[PDB]
Each structure stands twice: as structure tokens, then as C-alpha cells.
Design a protein around this nucleic acid. Structure first.
Ligand code: NA
Ligand code: NA
Length: 324
DNA sequence: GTCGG
DNA sequence: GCTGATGCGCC
DNA sequence: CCGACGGCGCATCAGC
């Protein structure tokens, strides 16, 4: 693509700041910069040129000046041939292994997957599973596979109880041809913000989906949220399917559509809707849409029956998931 | 690191 | 055994 | 010149 050399350099740096430096805000900055530049419709020929783009500053422009001049960045070279740093990056690719655990591991000489398998006694549950499915988790999910995944979930949840209301979100709902994980939202008439009845609502669904061997592993579970692994059924003539990440999320009925809206992405679209709404006199978040008082003071959550209503409130014309 | 009060 | 801090992954 | 930049659910460990 365009300025892919630059956008790579920046992402490489972002990851360095998160994993090795533990400097999360520099990480976000570098990302921001990589994403703008990736959107830019010309080949950048100077640092100064880039700078005009919001999120690019003194330091990144100068690093852009150097890459273009020399084809490479001297700081990055240095880092790629630092054993501690590269090893620490690598480890964090395992789900369950963040910068903290990565650093500790490498301090006691554990640097590779091999070293990890050798030491499964030193990993919690999550990490063990991440280890188990390392490659399968880096694979993308073509849209076809998703559809089969959906129907099963939808069916299985129907079987449990006919009043459950599952929606699948993420890229998939927007129509993207491949998606990273599977986010599922869940709700039921018996569950509202006020009417918090007995749980096991989420449990019995998880239970069911284990029972038809669609779910194969649990990374975390609780009253409202589940994270695990799942696998499409083996066609048997052919090669068994790769294991995927699944999240299921139980949300009160009075907050579903705000949940759906939020979790259907993207980062940018929400930030823009939240910013538009902000000045039109409403604050919306994961859970509710609330009007602001004359004084700039949130009143009460407005009722919501659909994604549409949230667009009504701010008089913004509807934008189907397709176009967000 | 970049931005904005 | 408890409660609160922190790590981790997530629009 | 200097703080904000996302806030949350669950698992785990530190401190008592
Ligand atoms: Na700029
Ligand atoms: Na990780």
C-alpha cells in the first residue's frame, strides 16, 4: 500500500513502547500517527509534510525525515538486535502474557515458546491456553466461517430459552470479509438494570454451548461476561477447524442497544458520534444516552428501543453497520 | 509523543 | 479468610 | 509549562 514503510516503522515503535517501555500513552500516540498516515492519499516526501497531519509532531516528523533519507531508523535497528527487547515483544504475543509477565519471564531466562512449554508450571490458566493455541489465535477468520459460527450460537441459545436475544458485533456486523474474534451480546426480559434476578442466565448458555462441543475452553467467566475458545465441528473428510476466540456478554435489557452500538465499532465512528452528540446536548457511553442540563450536568438515561433511537436523540441520520 | 488549556 | 491493588484483554 | 490521553470485568496476589 502507501507509505507502508512508515506505517510499519510506527507500529513497530508503538509495540516497543507498550511491551518494553510500558509507556501506554506513547503507544497510543504512535498508533494514532500510523493510522492517519495510512489514511493519507500521497507518498510523504518530508517530515515537515507529515507534521501537518494531526497526531504527527516534532519527533515523528524527524524520524520520518530519517527513514526517507536512509531507508531505515537507527533506534529501531538498535532495538531489533537487543535480546531483552525482542524477546519481550515476542512473548506478549501470547494471550495472557502482558508486558509485566513478559519482563519477569525474560529476567529468569525464559524467552521463547519452547522455553514456555518447558515451563508450563509457571503460567496461570489463561497463559497456558494462550500457549496451547498460539498460532490459531493469530489466524484471521474469513467471513464464511463466521456465518456458520453465528447460526450455531443463535440456534443453541434459542434452544435454551426462546426469549434470549443474541447479536454478534465487531467487524462481522459491519460486513468485513474477515474478523479477529467473535463478540456476542446477550440479554433477556428477566434482566434489567433494576430487575437483577438470579444469574445462571449466562451460565446456562455457556453450559449449553459446551454441551454441543462448540466451546472448548474457558479463559474467564462471571455473572456478566465470558471469554473462551471455540471450534466449528469437524467435517471429517477434511482438516479440523482452527480454534478461535469467543466472547459472550450479558447486558441489561435497558442497555442492550447502547451495548450493541458501542461494540459494533469502530473506535473512530463512536468517538465521532460521541463528539457530535456531546455538543448537541447528550452524553452517550457503553451503557446509556443522557441529556446534559443547562449547567452541563447529566440528567437521567433516556429510554431506548433500538439503535435508531440513539440517532433520533441527536438528530443524526442513521448509518447502517455497513457504513461506519 | 502529541495535544490543548 | 477478607478487601483492595494490579495485570490483562477489550470499542 | 504541564497534565490528559478509556474504563471495566474477571483472576490473581499482596497485605492483614
Ligand atoms: Na500535527
Ligand atoms: Na498478550
Amino acid at each position: 500500500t502507501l507509505n507502508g514503510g512508515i506505517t510499519d516503522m510506527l507500529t513497530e515503535l508503538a509495540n516497543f513502547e507498550k511491551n518494553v517501555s510500558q509507556a501506554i500513552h506513547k503507544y497510543n500516540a504512535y498508533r494514532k500517527a500510523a493510522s492517519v498516515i495510512a489514511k493519507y492519499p500521497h507518498k510523504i516526501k518530508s517530515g515537515a509534510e507529515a507534521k501537518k497531519l494531526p497526531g504527527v509532531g516534532t519527533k515523528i516528523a524527524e524520524k520520518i525525515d530519517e527513514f526517507l533519507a536512509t531507508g531505515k531508523l537507527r533506534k529501531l535497528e538498535k532495538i531489533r538486535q537487543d535480546d531483552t527487547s525482542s524477546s519481550i515483544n515476542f512473548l506478549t504475543r501470547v494471550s495472557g502474557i502482558g508486558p509485566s509477565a513478559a519482563r519477569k519471564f525474560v529476567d529468569e531466562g525464559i524467552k521463547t515458546l519452547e522455553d514456555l512449554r518447558k515451563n508450563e508450571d509457571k503460567l496461570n490458566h489463561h497463559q497456558r491456553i494462550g500457549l496451547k493455541y498460539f498460532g490459531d489465535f493469530e489466524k484471521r477468520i474469513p467471513r464464511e466461517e463466521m456465518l456458520q459460527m453465528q447460526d450455531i450460537v443463535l440456534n443453541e441459545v434459542k434452544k435454551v430459552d426462546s426469549e434470549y436475544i443474541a447479536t454478534v458485533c465487531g467487524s462481522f456486523r459491519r460486513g468485513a470479509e474477515s474478523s479477529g474474534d467473535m463478540d456476542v451480546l446477550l440479554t433477556h426480559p428477566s434482566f434489567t438494570s433494576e430487575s437483577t434476578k438470579q444469574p445462571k442466565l449466562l451460565h446456562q448458555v455457556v453450559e449449553q454451548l459446551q454441551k454441543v462441543h462448540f466451546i472448548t475452553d474457558t479463559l474467564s467467566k462471571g455473572e456478566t461476561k465470558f471469554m473462551g475458545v471455540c471450534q466449528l465441528p469437524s467435517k471429517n473428510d477434511e482438516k479440523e477447524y482452527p480454534h478461535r476466540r469467543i466472547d459472550i456478554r450479558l447486558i441489561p435489557k435497558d442497555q442492550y442497544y447502547c451495548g450493541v452500538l458501542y461494540f459494533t465499532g469502530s473506535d473512530i465512528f463512536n468517538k465521532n458520534m460521541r463528539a457530535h452528540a456531546l455538543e448537541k446536548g447528550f452524553t452517550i457511553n457503553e451503557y446509556t444516552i443522557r441529556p446534559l442540563g443547562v449547567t452541563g450536568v447529566a440528567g437521567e438515561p433516556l429510554p431506548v428501543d433500538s439503535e435508531k433511537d440513539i440517532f433520533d436523540y441527536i438528530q443524526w441520520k442513521y448509518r447502517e453497520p455497513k457504513d461506519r
